[PDB]
């Protein structure tokens, strides 16, 4: 192991980042709607038919 210790050396935000490039998408940008039955697997109706 190696215990390292970092202490900040700046009042303002000394390190900037930006969303710059985009390669692909993991999702499909699709419209296949999720089902309410799996996210609530206990609720049913009263009458069995």
Partner 1 sequence: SLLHTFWRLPVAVFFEPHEENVLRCPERVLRRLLEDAAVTMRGGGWRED
Summarize as ranges the residues that interact with partner 1 (CB under 8 A).
42-46, 48
Q: Which is nearer to partner 1, 17 or 43 (CB)?
A: 43
Q: Which is nearer to partner 1, 35 or 48 (CB)?
A: 48
Q: Which is nearer to partner 1, 21 or 37 (CB)?
A: 37
Q: Which helix or strand (DSSP H or E) is residue 28 part of?
A: none
Least Cβ distance, residue 44 to partner 1 (angstroms) = 4
Q: How far apart are CA 16 and CA 10, in angstroms?
A: 13
Q: Report CA torsion sign: 18, 21, 23, 28.
A: positive
């Amino acid at each position: 192991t190696q215990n390292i210790n970092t202490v900040d050396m700046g009042l303002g935000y000394t390190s900037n980042t930006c969303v710059a490039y985009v390669n692909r998408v993991r999702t499909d940008m699709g419209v296949r709607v999720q089902d309410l039955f799996r996210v609530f697997p206990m609720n049913v109706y009263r009458h069995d038919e």
